[PDB]
Design an enzyme around this catalytic site. Sequence first.
Site, PDB file in Angstrom:
ATOM      1  N   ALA B 107      -6.884  -3.610  -7.174  1.00 24.31           N
ATOM      2  CA  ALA B 107      -8.347  -3.755  -7.298  1.00 24.31           C
ATOM      3  C   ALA B 107      -8.646  -4.851  -8.328  1.00 24.31           C
ATOM      4  O   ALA B 107      -9.381  -4.577  -9.279  1.00 24.31           O
ATOM      5  CB  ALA B 107      -8.946  -2.423  -7.672  1.00 24.31           C
ATOM      6  N   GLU B 150      -6.853  -5.614  -3.024  1.00 24.14           N
ATOM      7  CA  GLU B 150      -6.633  -4.355  -2.274  1.00 24.14           C
ATOM      8  C   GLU B 150      -7.974  -3.804  -1.788  1.00 24.14           C
ATOM      9  O   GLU B 150      -8.884  -3.611  -2.608  1.00 24.14           O
ATOM     10  CB  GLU B 150      -5.916  -3.318  -3.135  1.00 24.14           C
ATOM     11  CG  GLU B 150      -5.534  -2.083  -2.346  1.00 24.14           C
ATOM     12  CD  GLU B 150      -4.451  -1.237  -2.987  1.00 24.14           C
ATOM     13  OE1 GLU B 150      -4.518  -1.033  -4.223  1.00 24.14           O
ATOM     14  OE2 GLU B 150      -3.537  -0.802  -2.244  1.00 24.14           O
ATOM     15  N   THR B 184      -2.472   1.406   4.430  1.00 23.50           N
ATOM     16  CA  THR B 184      -2.591   2.373   5.551  1.00 23.50           C
ATOM     17  C   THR B 184      -3.320   3.625   5.059  1.00 23.50           C
ATOM     18  O   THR B 184      -4.117   4.167   5.832  1.00 23.50           O
ATOM     19  CB  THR B 184      -1.211   2.658   6.153  1.00 23.50           C
ATOM     20  OG1 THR B 184      -0.385   3.201   5.123  1.00 23.50           O
ATOM     21  CG2 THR B 184      -0.575   1.410   6.723  1.00 23.50           C
ATOM     22  N   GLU B 244       4.286   2.798  -0.476  1.00 28.03           N
ATOM     23  CA  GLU B 244       3.660   3.256  -1.736  1.00 28.03           C
ATOM     24  C   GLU B 244       3.513   4.771  -1.645  1.00 28.03           C
ATOM     25  O   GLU B 244       2.406   5.302  -1.734  1.00 28.03           O
ATOM     26  CB  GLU B 244       2.328   2.520  -1.890  1.00 28.03           C
ATOM     27  CG  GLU B 244       1.908   2.281  -3.323  1.00 28.03           C
ATOM     28  CD  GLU B 244       0.453   1.874  -3.494  1.00 28.03           C
ATOM     29  OE1 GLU B 244      -0.341   2.008  -2.518  1.00 28.03           O
ATOM     30  OE2 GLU B 244       0.110   1.419  -4.600  1.00 28.03           O
TER      31      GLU B 244
END
Lengths: 290, 290, 290, 290
Positions: B107, B150, B184, B244
């Site tokens: 972010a 992101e 995802t 992740e």
Amino acid sequence: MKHGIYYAYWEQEWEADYKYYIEKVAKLGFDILEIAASPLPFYSDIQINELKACAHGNGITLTVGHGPSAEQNLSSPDPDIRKNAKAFYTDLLKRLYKLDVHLIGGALYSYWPIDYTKTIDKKGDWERSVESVREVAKVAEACGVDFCLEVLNRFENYLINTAQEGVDFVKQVDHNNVKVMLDTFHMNIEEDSIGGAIRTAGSYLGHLHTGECNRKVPGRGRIPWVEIGEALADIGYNGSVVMEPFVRMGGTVGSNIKVWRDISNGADEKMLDREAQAALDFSRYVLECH
Amino acid sequence: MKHGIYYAYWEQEWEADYKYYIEKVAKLGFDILEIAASPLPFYSDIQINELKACAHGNGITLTVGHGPSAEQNLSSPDPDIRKNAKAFYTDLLKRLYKLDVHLIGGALYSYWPIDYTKTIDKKGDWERSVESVREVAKVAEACGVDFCLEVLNRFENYLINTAQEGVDFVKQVDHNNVKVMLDTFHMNIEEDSIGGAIRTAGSYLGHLHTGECNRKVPGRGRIPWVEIGEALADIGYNGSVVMEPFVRMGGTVGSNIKVWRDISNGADEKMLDREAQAALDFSRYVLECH
Amino acid sequence: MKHGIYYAYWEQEWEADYKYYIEKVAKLGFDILEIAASPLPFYSDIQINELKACAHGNGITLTVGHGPSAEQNLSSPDPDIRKNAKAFYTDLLKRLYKLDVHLIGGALYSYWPIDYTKTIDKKGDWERSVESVREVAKVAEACGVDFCLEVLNRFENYLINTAQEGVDFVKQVDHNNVKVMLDTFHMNIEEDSIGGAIRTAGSYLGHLHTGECNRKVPGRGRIPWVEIGEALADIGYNGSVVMEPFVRMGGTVGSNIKVWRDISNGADEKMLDREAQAALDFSRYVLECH
Amino acid sequence: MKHGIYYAYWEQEWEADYKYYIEKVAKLGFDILEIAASPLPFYSDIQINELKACAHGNGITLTVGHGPSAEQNLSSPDPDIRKNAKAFYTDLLKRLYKLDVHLIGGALYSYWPIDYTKTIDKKGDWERSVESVREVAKVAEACGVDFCLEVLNRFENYLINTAQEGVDFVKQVDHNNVKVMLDTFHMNIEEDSIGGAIRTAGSYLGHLHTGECNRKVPGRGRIPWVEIGEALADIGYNGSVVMEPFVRMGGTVGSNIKVWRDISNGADEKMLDREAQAALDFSRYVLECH
Ligand SMILES: [Mn+2]
Ligand SMILES: [Mn+2]
Ligand SMILES: [Mn+2]
Ligand SMILES: [Mn+2]
């Protein structure tokens, strides 16, 4: 199977002229309007009677959703808050009895939205909540109400995030008027399997909220609706399905539901009506008797 | 296509001996280890050269993720916070150049985790962030770093929640070293279409994070891996894929990722290793060629 | 679960040096090689003992598939064909005893491929088949062989097209060693629900064939493998999983399986080996107990 | 987007009173009735104008499906069959012009059903068919008709099994009135990707047939309808969508479509009407406006 919609689909605050929405959803062909509990304590018995008469006159069943405040938190370690919470639910369940409402749903074991900066004591809140819900369940039985515990994604609650946790909590409460409530939006984040989650809930499933992954009206997104219909059939689901779509920015609803873009793509009231009715046709067709 | 994993899969805090995870991940057969930026500003030139040498010696490429603190918020209306943020990233990007790292993601337009109680000014933060990122981008170019933004679900940020918002932001920034990054886990919440989101990102897709809907290792959940593989082939994706997964309660990581149950099902380090390796074989097989 | 592949993935005729494929699949890490029955009646005792010893020494279990000829049609209205069919199966089953094989599968209630220009008498063929199969089942039981009835799509047979029809037929036969065999290729056409079909089969499911919609190796197509894994776990599936991929044009296999384009995309033997191994890793990972 | 249904959903023979079905589907809210070409050559000029008048009167557009007989095989190596085929299509296309029909679809490059016991010359039949179809296209251009080549599963034809093969054939024909036609039933067998097949067809897609995997009416089966809507929006599909459900045993239709069980679950005409209307509402809702 009975089909409903949450009034808040059209509104940006946790209150409205519910009579306006009873008339609307009756015309669109719904069986159920779900209403927020929070204004009900501000109703006179006259206002309760005339809301019930409106529902009866339009052939609509009312269900109730509540996001409890910190002061209404049955899980709280502060015994004063637990006492005030029990008083709040006792009053509310009695209003629901006067309203002819037989179902309340939400994070009723906890509060919503939660303060996540607070130190989390899951096992402590869990034990206190089970005890508190078991007490409140005696009032719910007396008032003819199903007390439905909503399974929420990790961002909105820490206590009950999966169908299995919900079954564990309700089993531990051990009272017929306490039920698991699942929500396609919440299942979409936390569950390994949607059909599996529904089958896990089985006889404990008392209510189902529907919405796409991004809370659009059911049908045009990635929620596996056919798999849900099949699983509801597998557990012989004797209960209602209320769609809970949120597509509008602004107000307490837009902020609490965290709608930060126009998901509605400029929809006016008539466009919201048309899409709700299309989603209702879809839900009756796809979810019923597999 | 190069495949990586985030060290944090094994760890409950936002730093570790990254050399340990380079060796593990090399043995498991990964191309990439993703590390947290947090400790890198405090690395001596010796520590930087040791990490770089370890990565090179083990045939592992390093990528970096960062959750910015409130003080590192490039969107901030407070110009002193913006000044600190720009200095922080300028120093960090110089260090990544020394470390031979060519990709940072997160972010980076904002901060994470955010305080959501604060009044939200999306338009203001957006315009300020675009301006701030464009400046940092010129240092990212000098340092040979892809600065990857992101796209996050509504619960973690309000600024960029869809691939389309990400593309809109990155086009407005208008700098070749600034990329969209999809995840995802995040797409699973906000997107109408997973394949659609990837094709929307297209040439701007600079990095892909993977995980199941509930952040388990890819393979046995509901994420449409084949559809993702097809969309990456459709756009001709030339970037890397870093899983992740977060399956462990406890610590800052457990708290920040909001793991409130044992999603790992009692996995020891050995079990986490094997599941990571299986997910890697799955990811190489299902996500490539199409 | 034990995992196999059909030798015919590599071969264009319904026979081969099975010893070559035992050594291949052992190297690739399969548990099972499925072989065609066709050549087995022409094996000498020492050829049977050699094949058996090859399998045993390589830690490979042999399963047998058979497409019965018109002359082996246990459903035939012609009593001479039924007599010859029973004599054929009796001899074959004794050969399977010598081979230490304990599973035969295919359209054993009928024949394959069928002549569809003939006037179809489903009712009559069904009654004769149940009777015939019950008699052959007693020979199978004496030989230690499970007699598995393959559920086929409408284009390949008319008797058993769904798991439910398979269950109905096997219930009527009412012999413990007679089982339903489902195939992801055949279910993909005829079934409302893949998970539903598997749960319908339940304790009657004795064998599972796998393959993508267009008969590629499992993993990169549209078959819902996760849903299959979940359903196999729901029914406590004890049997084995044999992949039946067909990707090559040419010969009787090419013609019978109706491969009219190069589905293999120019794959040589090493490429076929590697794709089979990737599909095996995928199958172990994704189908294994939920 | 215009929605239709094949009259044969209601009928067990390849003809009926089409005027009866024009009235019915108008009442159910369809834009299109698709009709079998078989009886149209037996129609007088008065009968043509009657059917055109019925269609116009009820606001219904007529499309035509055809399963060519062996003597109408444009791919035949026998130049007399090719001669007769071109004569048959020339007459049929002139009748279509008078009927005010602008679309015909089916295995128009070949015949249906085929004799699969014959030696297959795919390359030869392909070369002849392309040349034959190019000549018929001139007549189609004159009669103002889109000549739509149906991509079929391997069990029904060997020439064109995928959208890619469909595009290659149509592009080789190189004529504006020759189109690819896709069918959810056939795609479900042969295609790696449903979305990918539609995007492959792109501008060449002239017609789309819909039906579940087992040819039930759209909505309650495993066909990925949302993915189809998305891909149709991606290619800006300008054509119609005709559902082609087959749920009844008996007659030439039951035999040709190979319905060997009551897929209709004892549905009378009234029930078939209701399910078609449900599927139409579903199809308009899910397939449009992505
Ligand atoms: Mn809800
Ligand atoms: Mn991420
Ligand atoms: Mn098979
Ligand atoms: Mn068709």
